[PDB]
Assembly symmetry: none
Homo-oligomer: 254 residues x 2
């Protein structure tokens, strides 16, 4: 009769019958691979009802493949693997470095789909690029806790008696073609104490315009006056603020 019965049984595939058991001549039935199976590119996945109530032949067209290679932050799949989804056992794909990573020549940038439907062990075939030498801060220091490679962080400090002006840290970020420091080297500025205090009936011996950390000012009483106290005070520097070591002496008369 001008009708075919059930289409052939294909291993690891299921036909779409749309709720019927009888099909008219020329009816085309498509099969869908079952779970954990991917259709093999360049293969028939459907049958057709021909004359005599006979279906056209169809061969197994499903496998048995790995999943799409896992997402790496250092490397991207090369074409054409980056657009594929069919990865039967033995399939080997190639990677290429992302930015800012570069090839580690001693290691292969290839992964293979293993018998267990898993990709081979990952190695660091694409390593992190390195930022330029941080350099130096005059009268300050740079803290490099964990190298200067892509993603690294560094901090800046200013030695005792100096005040930091600018960024207090820097990160090695990807900069277009390469990786560069997010922020420039700051400045360590000399902290000044407030002008030294003057005293009644006494003077400051050779007063300077500016006084820095540990710099001292010496007092002297006027003729006829007796000094009671410290002959000199010095600049103490704490939490980036200048402050004199103590009060100035006193000059008592007569």
């Amino acid at each position: 009769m001008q009708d075919c019965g059930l289409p052939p049984d294909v291993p690891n595939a299921q036909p779409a019958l749309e709720g019927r058991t009888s099909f008219p001549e020329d009816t085309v039935i498509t099969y869908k691979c079952e779970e954990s199976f991917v259709k093999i590119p360049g293969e028939k996945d459907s049958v057709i009802c021909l004359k005599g109530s006979q279906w056209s032949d169809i061969e197994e067209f499903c496998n048995r493949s790995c999943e799409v290679p896992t997402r790496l932050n250092s490397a991207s799949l090369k074409q054409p693997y980056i657009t594929q989804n069919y990865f039967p056992v033995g399939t080997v794909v190639e990677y290429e470095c992302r930015p800012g990573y570069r090839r580690e020549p001693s290691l292969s940038p290839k992964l293979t789909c293993l018998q267990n439907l898993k990709w081979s062990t990952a190695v660091e075939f694409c390593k992190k690029k390195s930022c330029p030498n941080p350099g130096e801060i005059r009268n300050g220091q740079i803290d490099v806790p964990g190298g200067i490679l892509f993603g690294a962080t560094i901090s800046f400090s200013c030695n005792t008696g100096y005040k930091l002006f600018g960024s207090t840290s820097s990160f090695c970020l990807i900069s277009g073609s390469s990786v560069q420091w997010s922020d420039p080297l700051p400045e360590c500025r000399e902290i000044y104490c407030p002008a030294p205090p003057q005293i009644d009936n006494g003077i400051i011996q050779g007063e300077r315009d500016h006084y820095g950390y540990r710099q001292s000012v010496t007092y002297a009483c006027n003729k006829g006056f007796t000094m009671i106290g410290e002959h000199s005070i010095y600049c103490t520097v704490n939490n980036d603020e200048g402050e004199w070591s103590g009060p100035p002496p006193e000059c008592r008369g007569c």
Copy 2:
């Protein structure tokens, strides 16, 4: 042949030894009464002569000041320093003791006043001053009470420095002047012991010396995680350098 009582001399008293009769040739000496001093080059005694007659004697006592009181700033000049006769109007001269100096604007003279008292005393001989103490680098000099003769001064060394030498100085009289008993001490920078190195980590830019408040920063080698403070700093404790705490640790991953 015996003389009777010797003549009455104003402001003087004779020494009779309880006697009322005296044999020829007896010599009787008089002593000036209180507040009175015998006048140099004058007779103070009488003698019993023939005819039961005493030799003549004239008043020989002039009211006089006492020997000037001792001053610690000056001393009587010669010849006043050996005199005891100071009638009203007598003016003596002083000269400075050590360690004192003359106050040009003033007079070093005292006058015996009508009331038998010396004139008002002024500071004509003033305490000498030692030279300006000067400066101690990285230290201080405390001048509690001036730098005149007899004064004391103390020395200290700022935080992070240790004093080496004298801790005080006294203004002494030194021959023809006054000088500080002790020379200035030196304030030397205290160094902490070399910072400790750590396994699988380094010191970032180690220095040769570390002083007070100076810090050393650590960094772990690739593949190691730091455990503890990233940097430590040089503390000072009774002139000794000591690190703020232990260095971090670098744990294998």
